[PDB]
Amino acid sequence: YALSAQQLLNASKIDDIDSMMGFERYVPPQYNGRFDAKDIDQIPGRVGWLTNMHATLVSQEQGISGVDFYFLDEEGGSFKSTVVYDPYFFIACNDESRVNDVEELVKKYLESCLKSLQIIRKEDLTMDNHLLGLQKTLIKLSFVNSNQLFEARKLLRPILQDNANNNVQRNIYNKVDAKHLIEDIREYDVPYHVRVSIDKDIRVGKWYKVTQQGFIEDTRKIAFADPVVMAFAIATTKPPLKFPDSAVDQIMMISYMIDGEGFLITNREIISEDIEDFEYTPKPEYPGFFTIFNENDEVALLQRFFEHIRDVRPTVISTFNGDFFDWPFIHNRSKIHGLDMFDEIGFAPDAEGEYKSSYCSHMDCFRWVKRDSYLPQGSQGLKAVTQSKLGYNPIELDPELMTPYAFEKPQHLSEYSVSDAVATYYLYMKYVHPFIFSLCTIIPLNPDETLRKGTGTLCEMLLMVQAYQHNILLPNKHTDPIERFYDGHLLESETYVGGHVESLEAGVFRSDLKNEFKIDPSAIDELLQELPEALKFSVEVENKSSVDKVTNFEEIKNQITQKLLELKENNIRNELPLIYHVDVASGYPNIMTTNRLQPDSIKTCARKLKWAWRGEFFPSKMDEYNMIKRALQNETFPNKNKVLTFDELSYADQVIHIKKRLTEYSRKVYHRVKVSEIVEREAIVCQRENPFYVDTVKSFRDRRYEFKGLAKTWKGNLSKIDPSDKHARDEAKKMIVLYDSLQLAHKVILNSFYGYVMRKGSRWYSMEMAGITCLTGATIIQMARALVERVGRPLELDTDGIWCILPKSFPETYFFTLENGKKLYLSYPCSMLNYRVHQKFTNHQYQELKDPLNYIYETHSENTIFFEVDGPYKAMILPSSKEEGKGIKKRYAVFNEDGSLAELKGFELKRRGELQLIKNFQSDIFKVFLEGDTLEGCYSAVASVCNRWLDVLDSHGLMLEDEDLVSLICENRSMSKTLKEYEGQKSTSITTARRLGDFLGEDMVKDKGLQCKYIISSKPFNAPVTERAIPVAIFSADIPIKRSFLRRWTLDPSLEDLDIRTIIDWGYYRERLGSAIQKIITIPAALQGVSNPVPRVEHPDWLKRKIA
DNA sequence: TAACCGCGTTC
DNA sequence: TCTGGAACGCGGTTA
Ligand SMILES: Nc1ccn([C@H]2C[C@H](O)[C@@H](COP(=O)(O)OP(=O)(O)OP(=O)(O)O)O2)c(=O)n1
Ligand SMILES: [Ca+2]
């Protein structure tokens, strides 16, 4: 209909644009010989590196469905080739002996849109006897295009919903109709291009030969082709204190880089003078020679950008958040200027509002930064990312100086624009491009989708490929019920008990300051009894060798035994510690694969595993619940298109009202509004189920292990280089960052296999399997702690890792020597626990198909759960709570032996936003715990820094320049949603957002993600802090505006002193600094037996009493 | 006091 | 239409 025409027309537009960019549709010659990959060089065709793919319509050259594929050929050119393929989904039946009856129904019922029918079989993991070869019979419906596939779904849903409802009433005194035989539709929601990419085993990033028969992968060709890559960034005018408006604000410059060649177009109507060619090579490996394009006016600028793009023909354009700032600005500045960007460069927004093209992938690096970098949110800006992954500081410029510096210091502003471009091209080439394009080789998505789709969706794609290739029927996307009940109470949420976290000790621990250890002598007895087989376990399992080939096994056994035996005779010791960290490698994935954990396996073929369920429900019983429902049934409610009734509403809106009224009732009759209960649960895990899910996790884990191991290889290569070989250590350090980043980008995707069984809309949902994963790790990590606390002092614990200190005389690291001369590394702290993990947690019931033809299985033991050890570290600093007895989890600082920071967890320094005074305070303070000869001398050095920070606040800031003051006292906080979505809520961010609007206009709060830079006033006295919160920007406006809003915000019309120094609630920030000093310095010092080093910060009353 | 929320962390 | 999980710290309101 009118949908077809729009789609056929779009295909014609896209076809013309592709040809302008060098993608003419290529048809390979004919061949009547056998189609075999071995004979690839003789089958006529064209070879090309696959760079993109998109669904389209074809007109015998109604529309025909197909997928365009974009190639770069070996002769420096490009072409595209199309594959047609009939879209299809399946109809399931509830009586396989009458499948033809249903077949003859839908042939006539779907005669308007059906192209062909077929009876096919697939394996159904929910079917009885499916592990014996019994398959489910289905009707495969096929169509000419996707719109016809959707037309059939619209005709098939009435049948499915009518069968779910009961039958009509005819003769009350009384072979079923074939319409009732339709059980369900299946695989109806697979995106078409994912369907073609899976069924035809085509992947972006591989080499193919487009022949008449099909696509032949050329395994001979190895390395990727080199696409023409461009990355650009723009700079716009901006009213002071406000945001750029693509309506009124013009753009001044566009800076970009094409394969290393730098460019910068300028808008002379805004920037004052012509800019000469200049260079920005921030580090030697980032060459940046920039040729300038000075143009009269904005149109002239935009056509250079469009003409240059048209001439170099980029197949990848990279930006940094250019999907929601840059591209929409260029578009609107092209609309006002009468330029159609789509006819110019083939770029346009899509359904999600992101800007895309047919021939060119848009690589928004911010998506990679946000999803795969593993960097914190505070470190996700371009400057922080450039500092972390590129190893240099890019040029800075306060955005309020950008519009003026187009006039005053243009060249200064030309160096900032090129900086953003240099950092973006090399961020893409070094990190984003290799990662995403490699991922495309195994994921049936094009580059644009591999970069932006959620990691759970990426997992589902990987799993569907396995499911299809093993002829397993795809389950339909899971749907959660609108209401669930527990014990007669309406549930508000349910979950499983997740990871185990423990705060066990606080204070400073350093390798030069002795500690007191109490060694359980029975513990040493157990280690001595397990020592012979633990060392064998290290040889044969941990290093995949044989004790027959090690030549110092007895020496090592004796040295460890001697060290252990002395520790037993002296169980009370005051020694230097060893600050060690043990962590299970890929904990949850390895827990899953060890126990054959997968959603379809939750049902000696049965392994019972326990998990913990936690529910949150209303205190109201049924008898009450029904009462509030019938109350709302008698009420009127507004329409949404002039008044409706409860039952005339939707089910969703119904329970929305029920929940609100249920909360109110319980808050009165019960006072409590939500009750939480935990119940232990068991689940059967079949050990014989088709392991397509488990095997997918095992493969992707092994994929990550590759890069994780290379990061450890090169960490050792760098430790072997002499400090004088400067060029060698830089290459080694660059390898370390590259592989550490690659293994980290694989980490989120990996652990998303564990999270996917709880994702909304998941095809393989199982709360039980996730709950079992969490409880098992909780058992292992506590088993490990139970041993550490008997031999040393565990400090902190989270999920699968333990930080601890061990006596200096505890057996540490050893090196088996093989007859080959090669050595094997052994760390006894790790091997003692790994022998226990493999004594108590191995799955002895793991099963695999031996003979698949006769369906014979074998049973073996499996366990891939290993602690890895890092250390020994120079220092660890763990903070303590302000409340008595409580600890602080997920926060500490760790230092390497050479004095550099190893880890910094949780603290405000790294968190996004937060109070700059506390941020800057933490930066200066942690490195100071390294000073001092004794523990008491250590705390004194930190107190010196403390009292300097207390001095600036006690002096009401009089010691800082007013520029350093506006930065130290400000606190930034982001707003996830728009301010209108926070109605009925008070906070400092909301107040700042409201006042920013009453002063700079509602056009500021128009967009979510607003940063609220505020300072708290002492002005409304004894008033809630959420009200005394002023936008920092007010101290930067003209004086009348400042006083009006100030006096109003202070409730003091007698206010003429508009100096920020007088408005600040110094006592508030003095108390904030106090809580920081208490938790990092003084209160941990008390738990370590050192009197308050910072007496100006008084101890809590409970601490002063315990001191006595 | 304890429940409770928003944000951004550690797993 | 998209869309991995739970545990936790902290400032701040609220019952
Ligand atoms: N983003 C994350 C981080 C962690 N986890 C869960 C699953 C992990 O198995 C477990 C432990 O977290 P780690 O940081 O130890 O991650 P891994 O054990 O997977 O990796 P590593 O080998 O680096 O320890 O926490 C998760 O689900 N999602
Ligand atoms: Ca781990």
Author numbering: 30 to 90, 112 to 224, 232 to 660, 676 to 713, 719 to 1185
Please quote the authors directly.
The Saccharomyces cerevisiae B-family replicative DNA polymerases, namely Pol ϵ, Pol δ and Pol α, have been estimated to incorporate about 13 000 NTPs during each cell cycle of the yeast genome, and Pol ϵ seems to incorporate the majority of NTPs, roughly four times as many ribonucleotides as Pol δ. Other examples where an amino acid adjacent to the steric gate residue influences ribonucleotide discrimination are found among B-family polymerases. It was first shown in the ϕ29 DNA polymerase that B-family polymerases have a conserved tyrosine (Y645 in Pol ϵ) that functions as a steric gate. Our data show that Pol ϵ discriminates NTPs through the concerted action of a steric gate residue (Y645) and a sensor in the finger domain (N828). A comparison with other B-family DNA polymerases showed that both Y645 and N828 are structurally conserved residues, thus reinforcing their functional importance.
A series of crystal structures were determined of M644GPol2CORE (the catalytic domain of Pol ϵ (136 kDa)) in complex with dTTP or UTP and dCTP or CTP opposite the template dA and dG, respectively. The described structural changes were also found when comparing M644GPol2CORE-CTP with M644GPol2CORE-dCTP. However, a small ∼1Å shift in the backbone Cα-atom of the catalytic residue D877 towards the cavity between D877 and Y645 was consistently observed in all M644GPol2CORE structures when compared to wild-type Pol2CORE structures. This consistent structural shift in D877 suggests increased flexibility at the polymerase active site of M644GPol2CORE, something that was hypothesized when M644GPol2CORE was created for use in earlier studies. A deoxyribonucleotide has a perfect fit and stacks on the steric gate residue while N828 in the finger domain forms a loose hydrogen bond with the β-phosphate of the deoxyribonucleotide.
